[PDB]
Amino acid sequence: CPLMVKVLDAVRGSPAINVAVHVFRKAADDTWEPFASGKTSESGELHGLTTEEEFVEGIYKVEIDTKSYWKALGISPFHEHAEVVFTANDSGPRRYTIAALLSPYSYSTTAVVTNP
Amino acid sequence: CPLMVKVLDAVRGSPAINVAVHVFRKAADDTWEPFASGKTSESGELHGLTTEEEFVEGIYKVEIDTKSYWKALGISPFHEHAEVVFTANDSGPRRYTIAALLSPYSYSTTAVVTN
Amino acid sequence: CPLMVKVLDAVRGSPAINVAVHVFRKAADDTWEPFASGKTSESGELHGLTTEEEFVEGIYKVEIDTKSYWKALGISPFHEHAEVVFTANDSGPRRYTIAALLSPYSYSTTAVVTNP
Amino acid sequence: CPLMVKVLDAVRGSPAINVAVHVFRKAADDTWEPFASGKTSESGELHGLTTEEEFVEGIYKVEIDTKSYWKALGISPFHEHAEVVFTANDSGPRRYTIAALLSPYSYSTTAVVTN
Ligand SMILES: Cc1ccc(Nc2c(F)cccc2Cl)c(CC(=O)O)c1
Ligand SMILES: Cc1ccc(Nc2c(F)cccc2Cl)c(CC(=O)O)c1
């Protein structure tokens, strides 16, 4: 899969399971078009968001619903979400792994970008 | 100073200077209304973005133009920007420091909320 | 494997390949006994450091040679290494994934700890 | 103040206050010689660890007792401590800020090296 989102809970040192992830793609008129969405699995990984055909060049935004995640665990987090906005596939198709490492008042988002 | 944005360069171990930061308040129609912006100073800090009177509860987005910063340094960045979206809670009093640690393919943002 | 070390290069958005990783275990006399070592693979992952039999309770230190890594890429990094010191298996055997996210002047080390 | 340690709590979004920090200098026999220590203040910062005269080039270890901090808060931590090991380079002048962002199962440490 060309786009994978991984979410870790840095409080529990665990995959962040059942985290909603929405992917949007910036349309020609600069709106965010819904591109794909999903939930992280039991491994904190979200696979199959898209395909190599569908995942064309563009600016993509990945909004990870970190607030609902923290809230379901009784935590009032700082952020509404963890975002990742990036140009994808500018110099040809890549595999993107987006790793979000979550704490209630901090997150980090990293891209592991590999050439398939 | 109820809101202060601090930006660090994890590649050079330095303040990320001259980083454009835009703050938006979520408007009733779910759109982002420009609220404040600035450039990080020589200390990587952006003060005076807002005032206590202006900084009411609401959802705020802090957009840090991390891409232009990395471009200015000649390093290919992953992200278009860093985008900190949060609810100002105002169960107070509260100062917000938003620290963004910046690497070309990674960033962290942390809120240090005090007082 | 009960202990896995993953290393990512946050500058290149890539696995940090061929990174030396040394694992020590705190002996009875508070010295660090060499426990295991290895290199991260092409995926930035180091598997097979140890086994469930060998990986008994203890305090373990994982020293990731981040300096040699950065130096081989022409970068003078801040840290000599990325360390992780933790008590392992205190309430029974666990799987530990240690993820180190590396920048020349910053690193983050996260543990994904799962119950096998 | 050539060396300043700052510790943040990523769980509470606060300075990590009263965090024990030990600084060691690597001795010629490859062992760690205690050099300086302190507790983070109410601002999560530990100043006055050393002086310019004392802080010569060398390999330093900053041990942040993250475990006791998490215990004091009732949260099971992963790490025994956070351990920042680095060469003071002294191609100068140089101030070192070591920021440690602290989560129970994760920490980041960043050096902001200025001047
Ligand atoms: C290609 C890739 C890159 C990084 C990670 N892990 C990762 C990371 F990159 C940041 C924080 C936590 C974790 Cl687990 C992973 C998943 C893993 O560590 O097994 C895959
Ligand atoms: C020179 C310097 C560098 C970083 C920080 N803050 C900081 C922080 F407040 C949280 C996580 C990382 C960092 Cl580096 C600070 C303190 C601050 O203004 O928040 C100073």
Side-chain angles (χ1 to χ4, degrees), chain B:
Chain B
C1 210
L3 172 63
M4 199 242 50
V5 179
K6 190 165 197 173
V7 188
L8 304 175
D9 179 333
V11 168
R12 283 158 0 115
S14 76
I17 296 153
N18 286 339
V19 183
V21 172
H22 286 77
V23 188
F24 304 82
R25 188 158 186 280
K26 211 183 207 290
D29 39 283
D30 284 313
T31 69
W32 291 111
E33 173 155 325
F35 171 73
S37 54
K39 284 191 153 295
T40 55
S41 65
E42 313 88 286
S43 83
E45 289 173 342
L46 171 54
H47 284 84
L49 277 172
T50 185
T51 64
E52 201 129 0
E53 291 129 292
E54 171 176 284
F55 198 56
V56 298
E57 287 178 315
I59 301 169
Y60 292 82
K61 173 170 85 177
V62 174
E63 220 156 67
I64 306 164
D65 182 358
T66 59
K67 184 179 198 162
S68 299
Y69 178 72
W70 293 118
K71 273 220 271 275
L73 295 180
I75 307 161
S76 241
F78 175 71
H79 317 75
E80 284 302 298
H81 43 267
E83 178 168 332
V84 190
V85 181
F86 70 94
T87 298
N89 186 47
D90 196 69
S91 68
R94 304 283 205 76
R95 280 216 268 192
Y96 295 82
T97 299
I98 302 302
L101 186 51
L102 257 40
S103 296
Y105 274 69
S106 189
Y107 72 84
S108 77
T109 179
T110 303
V112 189
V113 180
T114 49
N115 286 178

Side-chain angles (χ1 to χ4, degrees), chain D residues 14-53:
Chain D
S14 76
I17 296 153
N18 286 339
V19 183
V21 172
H22 286 77
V23 188
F24 304 82
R25 188 158 186 280
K26 211 183 207 290
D29 39 283
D30 284 313
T31 69
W32 291 111
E33 173 155 325
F35 171 73
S37 54
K39 284 191 153 295
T40 55
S41 65
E42 313 88 286
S43 83
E45 289 173 342
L46 171 54
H47 284 84
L49 277 172
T50 185
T51 64
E52 201 129 0
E53 291 129 292

Side-chain angles (χ1 to χ4, degrees), chain D residues 7-8 14-15 17 23 29-30 36-38 41 43 49 53 57 59 68-69 71-72 75 78-79 84 101 108:
Chain D
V7 188
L8 304 175
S14 76
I17 296 153
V23 188
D29 39 283
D30 284 313
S37 54
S41 65
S43 83
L49 277 172
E53 291 129 292
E57 287 178 315
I59 301 169
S68 299
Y69 178 72
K71 273 220 271 275
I75 307 161
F78 175 71
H79 317 75
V84 190
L101 186 51
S108 77

Side-chain angles (χ1 to χ4, degrees), chain A residues 9-14 75-76 101-106, chain D residues 9-14 75-76 101-106:
Chain A
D9 180 329
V11 170
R12 266 150 284 274
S14 69
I75 286 151
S76 209
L101 174 67
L102 309 184
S103 304
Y105 277 72
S106 186
Chain D
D9 179 333
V11 168
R12 283 158 0 115
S14 76
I75 307 161
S76 241
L101 186 51
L102 257 40
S103 296
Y105 274 69
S106 189

